[PDB]
Design an enzyme around this catalytic site. Structure first.
Site, PDB file in Angstrom:
ATOM      1  N   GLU A 119      44.276  26.397  22.075  1.00 11.31           N
ATOM      2  CA  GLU A 119      45.599  26.347  22.692  1.00 11.31           C
ATOM      3  C   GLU A 119      46.654  27.093  21.893  1.00 11.31           C
ATOM      4  OE1 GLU A 119      43.956  22.067  23.859  1.00 11.31           O
ATOM      5  OE2 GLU A 119      43.636  23.464  22.225  1.00 11.31           O
ATOM      6  N   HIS A 146      64.551  -2.455  31.370  1.00 13.57           N
ATOM      7  CA  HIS A 146      64.719  -2.373  32.796  1.00 13.57           C
ATOM      8  C   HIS A 146      63.423  -1.951  33.473  1.00 13.57           C
ATOM      9  CE1 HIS A 146      69.231  -2.552  32.512  1.00 13.57           C
ATOM     10  NE2 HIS A 146      68.914  -2.225  31.271  1.00 13.57           N
ATOM     11  N   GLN A 177      49.803   8.930  18.345  1.00 14.73           N
ATOM     12  CA  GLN A 177      48.803   9.788  17.775  1.00 14.73           C
ATOM     13  C   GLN A 177      48.426   9.346  16.369  1.00 14.73           C
ATOM     14  OE1 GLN A 177      47.896  14.250  16.129  1.00 14.73           O
ATOM     15  NE2 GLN A 177      49.634  13.920  17.522  1.00 14.73           N
ATOM     16  N   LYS A 192      37.465  19.924  20.761  1.00 17.29           N
ATOM     17  CA  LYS A 192      37.770  21.312  20.439  1.00 17.29           C
ATOM     18  C   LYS A 192      36.555  22.229  20.640  1.00 17.29           C
ATOM     19  CE  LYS A 192      40.636  21.426  16.502  1.00 17.29           C
ATOM     20  NZ  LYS A 192      41.927  21.179  15.790  1.00 17.29           N
ATOM     21  N   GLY A 249      46.197  16.561   9.903  1.00 14.68           N
ATOM     22  CA  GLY A 249      47.215  16.974  10.838  1.00 14.68           C
ATOM     23  C   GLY A 249      48.204  15.909  11.267  1.00 14.68           C
ATOM     24  N   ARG A 250      47.701  14.714  11.556  1.00 10.86           N
ATOM     25  CA  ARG A 250      48.571  13.629  12.010  1.00 10.86           C
ATOM     26  C   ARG A 250      49.369  13.079  10.841  1.00 10.86           C
ATOM     27  NH1 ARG A 250      43.624  12.202  12.473  1.00 10.86           N
ATOM     28  NH2 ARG A 250      42.574  10.582  11.216  1.00 10.86           N
ATOM     29  N   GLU A 299      44.695   7.880  16.773  1.00  5.71           N
ATOM     30  CA  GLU A 299      43.832   8.924  16.276  1.00  5.71           C
ATOM     31  C   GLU A 299      43.273   8.544  14.905  1.00  5.71           C
ATOM     32  OE1 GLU A 299      45.505  12.867  15.750  1.00  5.71           O
ATOM     33  OE2 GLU A 299      43.541  13.683  15.303  1.00  5.71           O
ATOM     34  N   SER A 354      49.040  26.034  12.494  1.00  6.47           N
ATOM     35  CA  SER A 354      47.635  25.716  12.719  1.00  6.47           C
ATOM     36  C   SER A 354      46.836  25.630  11.426  1.00  6.47           C
ATOM     37  CB  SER A 354      47.025  26.760  13.655  1.00  6.47           C
ATOM     38  OG  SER A 354      45.700  26.439  13.994  1.00  6.47           O
ATOM     39  N   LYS A 355      46.261  24.468  11.177  1.00  7.94           N
ATOM     40  CA  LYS A 355      45.490  24.265   9.987  1.00  7.94           C
ATOM     41  C   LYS A 355      44.281  25.203   9.923  1.00  7.94           C
ATOM     42  CE  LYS A 355      43.358  20.457   7.334  1.00  7.94           C
ATOM     43  NZ  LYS A 355      43.101  18.991   7.323  1.00  7.94           N
ATOM     44  N   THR A 356      43.504  25.237  10.991  1.00 10.44           N
ATOM     45  CA  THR A 356      42.309  26.058  11.025  1.00 10.44           C
ATOM     46  C   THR A 356      42.610  27.481  11.459  1.00 10.44           C
ATOM     47  OG1 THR A 356      42.062  25.167  13.234  1.00 10.44           O
ATOM     48  CG2 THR A 356      40.784  24.171  11.598  1.00 10.44           C
ATOM     49  N   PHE A 357      43.685  27.641  12.224  1.00 12.61           N
ATOM     50  CA  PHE A 357      44.045  28.888  12.890  1.00 12.61           C
ATOM     51  C   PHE A 357      42.949  29.323  13.902  1.00 12.61           C
ATOM     52  CE2 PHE A 357      48.086  30.708  12.314  1.00 12.61           C
ATOM     53  CZ  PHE A 357      48.075  32.014  12.775  1.00 12.61           C
ATOM     54  N   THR A 358      42.270  28.341  14.510  1.00 15.29           N
ATOM     55  CA  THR A 358      41.244  28.627  15.516  1.00 15.29           C
ATOM     56  C   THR A 358      41.423  27.786  16.769  1.00 15.29           C
ATOM     57  OG1 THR A 358      39.793  27.043  14.368  1.00 15.29           O
ATOM     58  CG2 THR A 358      39.453  29.306  13.827  1.00 15.29           C
ATOM     59  N   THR A 359      42.404  26.894  16.767  1.00 16.64           N
ATOM     60  CA  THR A 359      42.607  26.008  17.887  1.00 16.64           C
ATOM     61  C   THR A 359      42.966  26.813  19.118  1.00 16.64           C
ATOM     62  OG1 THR A 359      43.349  24.335  16.337  1.00 16.64           O
ATOM     63  CG2 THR A 359      43.743  23.896  18.602  1.00 16.64           C
TER      64      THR A 359
HETATM   65  O1  LIG Z   1      64.077  -1.637  38.448  1.00 10.95           O
HETATM   66  C1  LIG Z   1      65.104  -2.295  38.332  1.00 10.95           C
HETATM   67  O2  LIG Z   1      65.412  -3.167  39.147  1.00 10.95           O
HETATM   68  C2  LIG Z   1      66.027  -1.978  37.206  1.00 10.95           C
HETATM   69  O3  LIG Z   1      65.504  -0.890  36.440  1.00 10.95           O
HETATM   70  C3  LIG Z   1      67.309  -1.497  37.845  1.00 10.95           C
HETATM   71  O4  LIG Z   1      66.987  -0.332  38.606  1.00 10.95           O
HETATM   72  C4  LIG Z   1      68.288  -1.107  36.772  1.00 10.95           C
HETATM   73  O5  LIG Z   1      68.728  -2.254  36.063  1.00 10.95           O
HETATM   74  C5  LIG Z   1      69.470  -0.418  37.421  1.00 10.95           C
HETATM   75  O6  LIG Z   1      70.208  -1.391  38.142  1.00 10.95           O
HETATM   76  P1  LIG Z   1      71.345  -0.889  39.137  1.00 10.95           P
HETATM   77  O7  LIG Z   1      70.783   0.290  39.879  1.00 10.95           O
HETATM   78  O8  LIG Z   1      71.665  -2.078  40.020  1.00 10.95           O
HETATM   79  O9  LIG Z   1      72.440  -0.509  38.189  1.00 10.95           O
HETATM   80  O1  LIG Z   2      45.130  15.741  14.417  1.00  9.66           O
HETATM   81  C1  LIG Z   2      44.355  16.681  14.539  1.00  9.66           C
HETATM   82  O2  LIG Z   2      43.470  16.905  13.710  1.00  9.66           O
HETATM   83  C2  LIG Z   2      44.536  17.608  15.692  1.00  9.66           C
HETATM   84  O3  LIG Z   2      45.661  17.196  16.473  1.00  9.66           O
HETATM   85  C3  LIG Z   2      44.879  18.952  15.093  1.00  9.66           C
HETATM   86  O4  LIG Z   2      46.089  18.786  14.354  1.00  9.66           O
HETATM   87  C4  LIG Z   2      45.128  19.943  16.197  1.00  9.66           C
HETATM   88  O5  LIG Z   2      43.921  20.229  16.887  1.00  9.66           O
HETATM   89  C5  LIG Z   2      45.688  21.213  15.591  1.00  9.66           C
HETATM   90  O6  LIG Z   2      44.651  21.850  14.862  1.00  9.66           O
HETATM   91  P1  LIG Z   2      45.038  23.061  13.905  1.00  9.66           P
HETATM   92  O7  LIG Z   2      46.290  22.659  13.180  1.00  9.66           O
HETATM   93  O8  LIG Z   2      43.839  23.263  13.001  1.00  9.66           O
HETATM   94  O9  LIG Z   2      45.267  24.169  14.885  1.00  9.66           O
END
Ligand SMILES: O=C(O)[C@@H](O)[C@H](O)[C@H](O)COP(=O)(O)O
Ligand SMILES: O=C(O)[C@@H](O)[C@H](O)[C@H](O)COP(=O)(O)O
Lengths: 555, 555
Positions: B216, B388, B353, B518, B271-272, B357, B209-214
């Site tokens: 979650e 598919h 992200q 946040k 962060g990203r 973001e 955590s960058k801030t250590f306050t997030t």
């Molecule tokens: O949605 C579809 O039709 C495809 O994703 C098929 O489900 C996929 O190709 C799988 O085919 P099968 O179940 O005949 O192997």
């Molecule tokens: O990209 C961002 O800035 C957010 O995703 C933060 O990374 C995310 O909230 C985590 O924050 P922190 O690392 O300060 O806890």
């Protein structure tokens, strides 16, 4: 195209042109205190309630009305009845569309070419019931007399994603069940990394394939078999570790799986709609058969709701109709599905296939090209994670992005006296609130001042901290995510897709783009063999092939 | 907005208006045999080659030229130099943007407020090196004298997705490393399902955590700690199982983690963009420290390429420029990232992200609102699975969707004498081919006839089997997906994002929408406590809260 020729559609479009400017959520809410009451629907399934709150939408009573009127005019009601009656509404393949029969717990007769499909639907269920009990109880033994501890689904697409999404989402109900693995991709990584963690003595492979000809599945399947025979060295042992979920008996036999080990399904079961069939065996094996039956009942309940409820208060219909509003009037290309539930981490991805593969079409029933938008691009990740990543764009980008926010009221893991779930819910409620009301220049200016920002720090920063809001969302909140409710939520969207499909006058149930992808790779394949440069394609495909080959050699 | 005022932009836009109709891939390829040669770029890193083939794009020599001209006019070159020099280009936070310093293996001095950031970057690396060795070798012991077998990253967003994507992608390099888990969501499911499979005696938690306050992360962190103390019952044992990746020393201390257990980073690390910092400790622990260094070198190589290569052949720049073409001229809302590699199953999501973001913005450096599109919606799943499912829409829908197809020439698992990888590659080559050339009415008519279809079966079916093609894609093919190459590919897109960001004149490096998220949940939270109905919000938020509460009680 039929849609554009529709009087109700034109009436809908002219109104949009006339009032879009009057559609502001803040104002719509303060000017009508019964806005949540009037723009929300409640379903009591008797196994939980589902709140479909679509009040934070850019809509008034007159639009919904018009939207409903458009549903009638487009014949959504009768088209629905066609599907439930088993008429061949998949007009391009000449097939019926009866995923609703797979979960027809009521057993009212449903005819396909004059013959009730039910006796066979149930015959296969019984068979899955009997097998699941045996495998789960330990009665079914592997080739060395051991019980099965690992069940491996080999299948791709419709024969993969559903069973994967559901077992993941119903994880808590798997006590006393073997572990489940999903190998779908032809990428050797998928099969190899899975096999490396298995003991052939206690692994059971399921070959889920409607046609039993899909390149990826049959190749994975053969690799699985060879890896198994290298250990077992006895072909008779295959009957103890390999089973099939297919409609093609001959193919199953030719592959080496014994007919008794086939759990069959029918051509009217579209893959992206197949989890309710034998294709959901993995689910039944993981969570038990009763839970499987609970899953189908929830869908059955939703079917009854889709079928007999008046359009004005029909959940799938309204969700479909709001989507049309945003797609054919506002022009939004995408539609996000944000489940605030870690167990539903694949839910959005499942409906990325269900929706996009169903309604990514441009040809109508009359064979003419649409001159309007159809299916949207569906994407999403679970909350709250997304709030820290892509929501930035939903909040401050240049795209309108309708969002479905979903969540259970009750979590499977009420740890810390419910602290985590309360936080989860609070984040769930506030994003749709914030997406809606945003934060004006003045609101951002006020807070910046309070923070003691200088006239010049404030001035440069301010506009960047401004949120325009007015970003529509749906909130779908249900009691608890049990097998039953899960089945109902999935079936809700299935029917959402169907309504939108009729409205656009397209075939939601074929997939020639996928059908074509299953034939495309034949030229290239044998050309990758050898060292000759390839020159029989466009310069790009040739140039890529030649780089691939040059790079085969590097170390 | 600056973009629209740009002469080169206007010149670009008028041409589009004049020629879009002349942009047909089939015709562009047969009319210029050197099309792949001229519209493709090759990077030899000395640790693998990367082929950036952008020949299947709706572009001619004159557009690219114009696109390049637009890059110069918008000052992409100097803005780049600002970032590399450590100027505070994150003008709204007043921060520098130096993710490129984290992997500055060359150690040329890079100044922030006059002080070389390098000595500290390296001091932290050494520290991660030393810790990784100890933990991986078994020298580091848990509170009962056991070795660590499980490393658990607790963090959300930028403190989660990168380390997750990379360990997943570098799985093959983890021999001799502990298992890694990523707990990010506040959803109790995430922590509970993870803890249930752990022994406190051999688990190591990392609080990223960058801030250590997030909210979650700190809540997950506390839950992790309490679960650990319930077993260990000795607070001194925490120093043996908990470490921090933060910039806030006081906070770390206040939480109960010993300063020696802090691996620090800096405010200029978004962060990203943080996986290259201490935040990537999990990676180093999983795959080993040398591999971590290899990852950063690849990015370092890409940095050098971004920095010193002329725009006309600069990988990140060209990819950025093609995106602008499709976004600001063609109007495409999304951009797909389709890695044909099961190990990269989170790659697209990571850049969902990173991109969204970063560039989901509407305010320019001058504080005026953009009057053009900015960042696109990025999504995708690995191939071939997508073929598919959602490709149906990319092939036959009503949206244009630029696609990046990516793939290693060499797989980590050349099972079956390379059968699976050949099939994978063949599917990789043919979709971009098919997306490009499609299949006309006549082509579909011809094949239908050959299939012995009747004049009336053929006639109804035909138009549905017709593909319009002309759907642009990029093919990025690299030698092999090693730590080094991975680092280069990620850094390539980082810089793609940056070029597009400058061109739009927005701040790619702040995220007020996330910053706001946040703070949003504070009202709601305490209101969920108790049984009173809530009435202090709009009717929707109140109605949802009241349903949540009514449903708390149901059984
Ligand atoms: O949605 C579809 O039709 C495809 O994703 C098929 O489900 C996929 O190709 C799988 O085919 P099968 O179940 O005949 O192997
Ligand atoms: O990209 C961002 O800035 C957010 O995703 C933060 O990374 C995310 O909230 C985590 O924050 P922190 O690392 O300060 O806890």
């Amino acid at each position: 195209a039929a849609l554009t020729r529709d009087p109700q559609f034109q009436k809908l479009q002219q109104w949009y042109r006339e009032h879009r400017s009057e559609l502001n959520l803040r104002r719509l809410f303060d000017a009508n205190k019964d806005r949540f009451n009037h723009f929300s629907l409640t379903l009591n399934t008797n196994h939980g309630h589902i709140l479909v709150d679509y009040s934070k939408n850019l809509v008034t009573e007159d639009v919904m009305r018009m939207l409903v009127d458009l549903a009638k005019s487009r014949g959504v009601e009768a088209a629905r009845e066609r599907m439930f009656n088993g008429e061949k509404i998949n007009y391009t393949e000449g097939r019926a569309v009866l995923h609703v029969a797979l979960r027809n717990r009521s057993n009212t007769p449903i005819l396909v070419d004059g013959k009730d499909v039910m006796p066979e639907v149930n015959k296969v269920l019984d068979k899955m019931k009997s097998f699941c009990q045996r495998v789960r109880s330990g009665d079914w033994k592997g080739y060395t007399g051991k019980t099965i501890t690992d069940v491996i689904n080999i299948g791709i697409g419709g024969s993969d994603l559903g069973p994967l999404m559901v077992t993941e989402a119903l994880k808590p109900y798997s006590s006393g069940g073997p572990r489940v693995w999903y190998v779908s991709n032809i990428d050797g990584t998928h099969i190899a990394k899975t096999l490396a963690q298995l003991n052939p003595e206690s692994s059971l492979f399921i070959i889920a394939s409607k046609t039993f000809t899909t390149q990826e599945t049959i190749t994975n399947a053969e690799t699985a078999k060879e890896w198994f025979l290298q250990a077992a060295k006895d072909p008779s042992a295959v009957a103890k570790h390999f089973v099939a979920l297919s409609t093609n008996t001959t193919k199953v036999k030719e592959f080496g799986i014994d007919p008794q080990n086939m759990f069959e399904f029918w051509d009217w079961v579209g893959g992206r709609y197949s989890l309710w069939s034998a294709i959901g065996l993995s689910i039944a094996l993981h969570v038990g058969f009763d839970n499987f039956e609970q899953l189908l009942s929830g869908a059955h309940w939703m079917d009854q709701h889709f079928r007999t409820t008046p359009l004005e208060k029909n959940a799938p219909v309204l969700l479909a109709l709001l989507g049309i509003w945003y797609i054919n009037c506002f022009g939004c290309e995408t539609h996000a599905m944000l489940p605030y539930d870690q167990y539903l981490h694949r839910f959005a991805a499942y409906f990325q296939q269900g929706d996009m593969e169903s309604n990514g079409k441009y040809i109508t029933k009359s064979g003419t090209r649409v001159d309007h938008q159809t299916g949207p691009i569906v994407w999403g990740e679970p909350g709250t994670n997304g709030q820290h990543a892509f929501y930035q764009l939903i909040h401050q980008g240049t795209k309108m992005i309708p969002c479905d926010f979903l969540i259970p009221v009750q979590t499977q893991h009420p740890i810390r006296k419910g602290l985590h779930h309360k936080i989860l819910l609070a984040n769930f409620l506030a994003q749709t609130e914030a997406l809606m009301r945003g934060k004006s220049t003045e609101e951002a200016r006020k807070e910046l001042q309070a923070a003691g920002k200088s006239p010049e720090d404030l001035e440069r920063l301010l506009p960047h901290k401004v949120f325009e809001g007015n970003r529509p969302t749906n909130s779908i909140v249900f009691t608890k995510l049990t097998p039953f409710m899960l089945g109902a939520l999935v079936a809700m969207y299935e029917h959402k897709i169907f309504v939108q499909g009729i409205i656009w006058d397209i075939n939601s149930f074929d997939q020639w783009g996928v059908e074509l992808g299953k034939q495309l790779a034949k030229k290239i394949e044998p050309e990758l063999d050898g060292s000759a440069q390839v020159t029989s394609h466009d310069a790009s495909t040739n140039g890529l092939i030649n780089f691939i080959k040059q790079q085969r050699e590097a170390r």
